[PDB]
Amino acid sequence: QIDGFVRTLRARPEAGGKVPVFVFHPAGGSTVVYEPLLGRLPADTPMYGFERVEGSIEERAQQYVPKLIEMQGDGPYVLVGWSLGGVLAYACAIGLRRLGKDVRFVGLIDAVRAGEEIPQTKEEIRKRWDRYAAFAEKTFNVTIPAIPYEQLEELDNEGQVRFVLDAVSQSGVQIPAGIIEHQRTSYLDNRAIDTAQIQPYDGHVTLYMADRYHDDAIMFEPRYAVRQPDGGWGEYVSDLEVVPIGGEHIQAIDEPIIAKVGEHMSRALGQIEADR
């Protein structure tokens, strides 16, 4: 059930069968989080999960898309993700369409863009790490020394993190590798979103929309405290459907809220099977 970065959540028959749902991992998690959604989809709906790969969002899609095509040929494609996973599903939809494939459904499970753009500037890096340092001070009750802004503002997100980690390790702090790697990859995967070069998509997108981001997302990036009515997708997607689901972002992937997603999604899938 594991093949490279592809997890089989429910296998498709040797030949024929219903259209698979492809799900994409959230930052800091695997596609096992889609098991509740799977329970609320029609019986025998196949489901395959795409796990983490490296690079910009575009570079990640460039590794996913050939695999998608190896598995599902010309389509139809049903692409679904929560959080980062929604952004990844979209980037794959864009890629698949350029190659002429048939993309029938893109499900964004509260993959809501920050309500203001995140500036890609040296000033914002300075401000960001000033905030992070102030939070570190209250939490671990230490006094943080002068941040070396000159070094930090010249680095990309992965460079910034590597620098801060090296400083932390230098400072004498010993942290178990699993915790570091989980924190580091979650952080960088969520930051990857900020520079996703988002393209218009000519098909149907469903955005399942919670009420708000949870506090930790806002502490990660304060601009997530604001949401636009189209979740930031309205300019790029002509055929955008929004389905309000309530709750917080972190609740959207679980029961009971996931039942509302699965019920609507089940109807979309049903229509796809009829149109076959």
Q: Key terms for this structure?
A:
9 helices, transferase, alpha/beta, about 280 residues, eight-stranded mixed sheet, monomer, Thioesterase domain
Structural features, described:
The PDB classes it as transferase. Keywords: Thioesterase domain, D1607N mutant, Pks13, Mycobacterium, polyketide synthase, mycolic acid condensation, TB Structural Genomics Consortium, tbsgc, alpha/beta hydrolase, thioesterase, transferase. It forms a monomeric assembly. The entry is titled "Crystal Structure of the D1607N mutant form of Thioesterase domain of Mtb Pks13". By secondary structure, the chain is an alpha/beta fold. It contains nine helices and eight strands. Helix 3 links the parallel strand 5 and strand 6. The radius of gyration is 20 Å and the shape is elongated. It starts with a strand and ends with a helix. 30% of the residues are buried.
How do the strands of the widest beta sheet line up side by side?
1-2-4-3-5-6-7-8
The proportion of strand residues reads 15-25%
Q: Write down how many β-strands occur, each being a DSSP E stretch of 2 or more residues.
A: 8
Distance separating the two termini: 28 Å
Query: In angstroms, what is the radius of gyration?
Result: 20 Å
Major β-sheet annotation:
8 strands, mixed
Order of helices and strands: EEEHEHEHEHHHHEHEH
Question: How many domains would you count in the coordinates?
Answer: 1
Looking at how many chains there are and whether they match, the oligomeric state comes to monomer
Overall morphology: elongated
Helix content: 40-55%
How many helices?
9
Instruction: Find the structural class using helix and strand composition.
Output: alpha/beta
